[PDB]
Amino acid sequence: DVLTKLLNRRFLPTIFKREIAHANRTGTPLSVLIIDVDKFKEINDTWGHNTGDEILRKVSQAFYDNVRSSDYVFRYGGDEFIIVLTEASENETLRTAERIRSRVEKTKLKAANGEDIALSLSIGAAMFNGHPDYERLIQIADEALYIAKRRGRNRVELWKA
């Protein structure tokens, strides 16, 4: 059960505080992806929870196949996940997000009527900038995610000022 591997959101503060101190002291990059499964509620309502659960498993596996054991994958909300990447530059963070976006888009998953359900992700990315408050990093990634949603979904946006 790949779903049992996902980290619970209660551990966000502890992991972030550790990784923030680590990044400040080592000068390594630290970044966040906040990821929404496009149309998840509509899909769950139309096709039911078996289909929804299967989608969550396929999406979760796409995350694990594209990150390292030193990265973290959390369940953030009903439709959403947070990935914390350690030692990924801005370019590598964007490449990782794109690999994940593309993998989900290409995933074939059949509904009860034999149609393939179109799956996609919206992703907001942000780089840690040295500030001690992890909530600020989440907020800027979430602003980028909102822009990804409003610009039509199935896309990655990087926060910039």
**Strand duo 30-37 + 155-158: pairing:** unpaired
Euclidean distance between CA atoms 144 and 159, whole angstroms: 5
Helix pair 134-150, 12-26: axis angle to 10 deg: 100
Q: Which helix (H) or strand (E) holds 123?
A: strand 121-127
Decide if 140 contacts 126 (C-beta within 8 A): yes
For 86, the 3-state DSSP assignment is strand
Resolution as reported, in Å: 1.2
CB atoms within 10 A of CB 47: 19
Q: How was this structure determined?
A: X-ray
The residue whose two tokens read 């990044």 is: 23
Euclidean distance between CA atoms 159 and 127, whole angstroms: 8
Q: Which fold has domain 1-161?
A: Alpha-Beta Plaits (3.30.70)
- Annotated binding residues for substrate, written as ranges, equal 44, 53
Question: What are the residues whose beta carbons fall under 8 Å from the beta carbon of 118, sequence distance 6 or more?
Answer: none
Question: What are the residues whose beta carbons fall under 8 Å from the beta carbon of 91, sequence distance 6 or more?
Answer: none
Q: How far is CA 35 from CA 67, 81, 111, in A?
A: 14, 5, 23
Q: Which of 109, 121, 113 is nearest to 52 (CA)?
A: 109
Decide if 112 contacts 42 (C-beta within 8 A): no
Active site residues: 79
Euclidean distance between CA atoms 58 and 3, whole angstroms: 9
β strands within 72-120, DSSP E: 72-75, 80-86
Decide if 15 contacts 70 (C-beta within 8 A): no
Token pair, residue 88, equals 């990924």
What does the angle CA 154 – CA 160 – CA 161 come to, to the nearest 5 degrees?
Answer: 140
Question: What are the residues whose beta carbons fall under 8 Å from the beta carbon of 130, sequence distance 6 or more?
Answer: 23, 24
R_g over Cα of the chain: 16
- Annotated binding residues for Mg(2+), written as ranges, equal 36, 79
- Annotated binding residues, written as ranges, equal 36, 44, 53, 79
